[PDB]
Structure formats: structure tokens, C-alpha cells
Amino acid sequence: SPVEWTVMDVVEYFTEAGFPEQATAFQEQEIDGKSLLLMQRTDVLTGLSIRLGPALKIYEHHIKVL
Amino acid sequence: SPVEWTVMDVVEYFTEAGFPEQATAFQEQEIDGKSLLLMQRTDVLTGLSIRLGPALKIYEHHIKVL
Amino acid sequence: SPVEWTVMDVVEYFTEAGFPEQATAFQEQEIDGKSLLLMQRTDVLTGLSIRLGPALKIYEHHIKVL
Amino acid sequence: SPVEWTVMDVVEYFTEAGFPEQATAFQEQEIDGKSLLLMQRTDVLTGLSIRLGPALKIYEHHIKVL
Amino acid sequence: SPVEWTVMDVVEYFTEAGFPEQATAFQEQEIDGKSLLLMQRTDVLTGLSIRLGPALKIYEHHIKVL
Secondary structure (H helix, E strand, O other), X not given: OHHHOOHHHXXXXXXXOOOHHHHHHHHHOOOXXXXXXXXXXXXXXXXXXXXXXXXXXXXHHHHOOO | OHHXXXXXXXXXXXXXXXXXXXXXXXXXXXXXXXXXOOOOHHHHHOOOOOOHHHHHHHHHHHHOOO | OHHHOOHHHHHHHHHHHOOOOOHHHHHHOOOXXXXXXXXXXXXXXXXXXXXXXHHHHHHHHHHOOO | OHHHOOHHHHHHHHHHHOOOOOXXXXXXXXXXXXXXXXXXXXXXXXXXXXXXXXXXXXXHHHHOOO | OHHHOOHHHHHHXXXXXXXXXXXXXXXXXXXXXXXXXXXXXXXXXXXXXOXXXXXXXXXXXXXXXO
């Protein structure tokens, strides 16, 4: 069912997970649930235009695990 | 068939697949069917200057399947 | 241990290691100890916006070894 | 042989191969025959500042084969 | 010895080797001898922001060989 999430659902996930500043980049890049499940390391660290510290933890604990 | 597509045909393919906004990047880069069949992941995700969410779906669900 | 460090501690480490100017990029990118332990080569060399000469030493001598 | 070409010879080759506009990037980047023989895929697709459609053909049909 | 070289020594090397214009990029990035010995292909071809033809030859004949 995460594969069905809208862009706004993804934004809400990253907000509640502790990354409200970076959640807006998921909106900017139109990352819905389908796209979220396709993201790889470089997509998080370079493709969102977010700060690197948060990006590393977003990837490690919330995207690599998917 | 894809090997026979002009740039115009490529734009039509992505428009009909639900990516009318990103289809313009194939116009900008003048990617016809022969070049489309040569694209790899990074070419789509970084070489087109399109939003990452759509780019991931464009590559994985539409280009890899040609 | 380094993985427990605050961003402030990371900045202090690099300041005292010989990189007072590059330390500000660890502040800007919000690199805490958890992030520091997740960094790979390209993250240091391309993700911090610092001079490449110092970046190569920062990675080789201080981050790769973590 | 191509490895012996001057920059101007490289420009001439790409001009006569169907890429008169992209040939100027070989002049700008000062790609002589020795350089041409050292190019890898990413160098063609991201190092010349040319349209990606033509770049994919330049690599696949003309540089990869050297 | 080259491990002890300053940035100035690196600039002299690349100038005398036939790359006076690209030597400036080693100044910009403050690549001394210790850092020169750590450079990999992408560090030269992208990390210095120099022209690609010279970069390819610099890497092949002067940096990869180290």
C-alpha cells in the first residue's frame, strides 16, 4: 500500500519522521509512493537538492530499508 | 516501433504515457527512438533536467520496457 | 565515539584537525556523527562544496577510517 | 589512425559524420585524437555540453568503437 | 619527494609537463603532493573544472600512473 501513496503522503511521512525541512523536496521532485520505492542512494544524496547530513539519514533509515 | 521513432514520436510516447511535462525534455535533448533505446538510468535521472519522481517512473516503467 | 557526536562536535574535530575553513561545510550540511559514519568518498569530495585538495585528505585520513 | 588526429581532425570527423553542431564541443574541449581514444561514456554524455540525443549516437557509434 | 610537494610544486609539474593553463585548477583546489596522490579519474575529469581533452591526458599520463 505505500506504493499507492500520493506525493502529499510522502511529504507527510518525511515530516513525521523528523525531516520537515527536507519533506518539501519530495514535493518539489514529485516523489509519490511509486517513485519512492525506486529511489537509490544517489537519488537521495544528489537528486533532491537537500542538505547532506539529513540526506544520509533519510536514505539509511527510510529509503534503503524499503 | 521505437527504432523508427522521430523526436516527435518520442514526445508522443511520453505524453500518452502520462508525462506531458517531461516529454519536453526529450524535445530539448532531441532524443529520437534510436537514442532512446541507448539511454541508461543516469541519462534520464540527471541528463534531462526533469523532476526526479517522474524521471524514476519514466526510466524504470517506460524506457527499460522498450 | 564519533558516531555519537553533535554537528558542533564534528565541526570542532575538523577545526582541530587542521581544516578550520572546511569545518564550516560540515556545519552547513548538518553533518553530525551519525551522518559522518555514513559518508562515502563522493559525499566528501562532491557533497560539501569545499576545495578538492583538502577534501581528499579529509576523506582519506579522517572519514574513510571511521 | 584516429589516435594521431589533431583537434581539427576530430572536429572534421564529427562534422562529416552528421554532427556539425556538436563538433564545436570537441574544439572547445580541445579533444585531439589521443584524448578521443581515452574518452569513456560519461565523458561524451556529460563532459561536452551537447544535446543528449546526438551525444548518445556520438558515443555508441563513433567513440565506443575506437 | 612528491609526497612533500606544495601546491606550488604541483603547479610547476603540470606547467612543465605541458599543461600551463590547467595548472591553475590545481591552485584553485589547493592540490598539493599528498592530495595529488589520492586523485582518481573523476577527480580530474570533473573535479577540477578543466577542459576535457587536457584532463584526459593529465589523468592518463600523469595521475593514473602515480
